[PDB]
Design a protein around this ligand. Structure first.
Ligand SMILES: [Cl-]
Ligand SMILES: [Cl-]
Ligand SMILES: [Mg+2]
Lengths: 282, 285
C-alpha cells in the first residue's frame, strides 16, 4: 500500500483546485494523536500551546513558497481546548510572489473559530545572526534559576507543564538592569525519536518561551498568568535537533505585557532559530 | 510519520465547511504509475475510463462509511497523461448514504471535469449468484484470441500494451446469444502493486475490452469503442483473484454498446458487478 510522509501536526496536505494558489492541511492536535500535548495545561485542562502555531507556520513556508523563508506577525486568537481528537485546518493563500496569508481554524459542532493568523515570507534574504560563546554567556549570567522552581511558580497562576514541557533545566540571569537570560533547554528524551519532520518541536519552543519569565524584570512586575500571544518574526536557519540553549532579550516588560527576542542555540552557540518580538500577556 | 493513501486518489482532506465535503489531490501521471503508459489512444497515454471507476469505488468507504456502490458514473473528456498529471477528486454528502462525486484536472489556467457519479452507502444489494465456469464455457464454444482482439483495436487507434493485455481469450456462441465469457487476469508483474485498489484499473479495462469480442458488437459497432460511463458499479469483496468476466450485451448499434458485466473468481463467484457499461467513440480527436 503506498504512503505519503506528512508533517506530525499539519497532517494531510492539498492544493485547492483554483486560482490564486491556496494550500489546505487537515491535522489532528488531539491528545490521542499527540499524548505529549496533555502536558501543557491552563487551569488543569489541555490547551494547545502558542508554540504549536509557531511550528505550523514555520512548517508551511517551504511547501507554499519553495523555501524555509520566515513567518511574520503570527497572532494567537481564542485559546484552543484539546480533546482526544481535535481537528485543525491550516490554510495558506499566495497573495503575491514570495508572500502568503496563513491561518489555523477549528470547529465546535457548528461554528468556525480562527485560532492563529500570520504572513509567510519566502523572499526575505535574511543573514543568520552571529554565533555566541556559551561559556561567555554563562560567565555573564551568574545567578541560576532552577527549572523546577520556575515551573512551580507557573503552577501558582494555573499553568501546568508536565514532563513533555519540562525541557527548561535552568535559566541564568544577572540583575534586572541586564536585559538578557541564558537558559539551558532541551527537548525531553522521549520526544527526541519523533523530532524529524518538525522545524522546531513545540515542546522545546515552549520551554524556550518559559525561560523569558525567569528574567528579574519580568519577576518584578508580578503580572500573573503570562501566556504567548504572538510572535513578530520567526525564522529557522537549520535543524533544531541540537538546540541546548536559549538566549532571550527583554524588549519591554510592564502592566500591558512582556515582549522578548529569542535565539535557540546549539552547544557551540550557533543560532538555529530566531523568535523576535515574542509577546506575552494575560 | 506517514499515512496510507489510495494510489490514484492521493492525499485526502475534509473541507472546513458544512454540508460535509471531501477533497483529494492525486497524481495519475506515468512517472508515478508507469503501467498507465500502456493505455494509449492515437499513440499517446490517456487515462482509461476504468481508472475513474476505481476512484469512485475507493471513495465510497471514506465518504459514507461502507463500500456501498457507485451510480451513474460518466467520463466524457479523455485525459492525456504526462509524467505528472494532477487530479482533484471531490465528494459532497447530499443526504445520509448519498454523495455527489467528481473528478477534475488543470491545463494552463482552465478547469476540466473528467468524471461525475453518485456514491451510495444505503443500497442493501445482494451478491448475484455464482456460476459454473465449465457450464459457461460449454455454452460459448467459439474462441476469440486476446492478441487478435487487441490488434483489431489497434486498427482504430487504441493501443493496449502489456499492463492492459490481461484478456487472454473470450468465448462466444453466435450474435443471437447475448453473452460473452472471457478469461481475464491482472498481468503477473502488476500483482505486487495491487494493494489499496478495490479493482485494479488494468484488470477492469481488460474486462471492458472483452465486451467487444461479442459477435453482435463486431457485426454492427465498427468504430472506436471506448468506455463512456457505467450505470451501476459494486464490489462484493476483494478482486485480487478475478479470473473470468461474464458479460451481456444489452444494446448494440452503429454508434456504441451497452453491456452488463460480472467479474468472477476461478470458482465462478461474482466479485464485482458493472451494469450499464456504455461504449462509444466519445471524443477521440
Ligand atoms: Cl509582512
Ligand atoms: Cl487516499
Ligand atoms: Mg513517465
Amino acid at each position: 500500500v503506498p504512503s505519503v510522509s506528512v508533517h506530525p501536526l499539519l497532517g494531510s496536505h492539498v492544493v485547492l483546485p483554483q486560482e490564486p494558489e491556496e494550500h489546505l492541511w487537515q491535522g489532528d492536535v488531539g491528545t490521542e494523536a499527540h499524548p505529549w500535548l496533555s502536558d501543557h495545561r491552563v487551569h488543569q485542562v489541555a490547551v494547545l500551546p502558542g508554540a504549536a502555531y509557531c511550528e505550523m507556520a514555520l512548517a508551511a513556508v517551504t511547501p507554499v513558497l519553495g523555501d524555509t523563508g520566515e513567518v511574520h506577525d503570527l497572532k494567537f486568537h481564542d485559546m484552543l481546548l484539546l480533546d482526544d481528537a481535535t481537528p485543525v485546518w491550516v490554510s495558506a493563500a499566495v497573495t503575491a510572489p514570495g508572500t502568503a496569508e496563513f491561518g489555523v481554524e477549528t470547529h465546535q459542532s457548528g461554528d468556525r473559530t480562527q485560532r492563529a493568523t500570520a504572513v509567510l515570507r519566502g523572499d526575505v534574504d535574511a543573514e543568520r545572526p552571529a554565533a555566541h560563546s556559551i561559556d561567555a554567556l554563562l560567565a555573564a549570567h551568574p545567578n541560576r534559576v532552577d527549572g523546577d522552581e520556575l515551573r512551580a511558580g507557573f503552577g501558582t497562576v494555573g499553568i501546568g507543564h508536565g514532563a513533555a514541557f519540562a525541557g527548561l533545566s535552568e535559566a541564568y540571569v544577572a540583575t534586572a538592569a541586564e536585559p538578557t537570560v541564558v537558559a539551558a533547554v532541551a527537548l525531553p528524551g522521549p520526544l527526541r525519536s519523533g523530532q524529524r519532520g518538525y522545524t522546531v518541536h513545540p515542546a522545546l519552543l515552549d520551554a524556550c518561551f518559559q525561560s523569558v519569565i525567569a528574567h528579574p524584570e519580568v519577576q518584578n512586575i508580578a503580572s500573573g498568568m503570562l501566556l504567548p500571544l504572538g510572535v513578530r518574526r520567526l525564522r529557522a536557519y537549520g535543524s533544531t535537533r541540537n538546540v541546548r540553549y536559549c538566549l532571550s532579550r527583554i524588549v519591554k516588560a510592564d502592566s500591558f505585557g512582556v515582549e522578548a527576542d529569542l535565539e535557540l542555540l546549539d552547544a557551540d552557540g550557533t543560532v538555529l532559530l530566531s523568535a523576535m518580538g515574542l509577546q506575552l500577556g494575560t
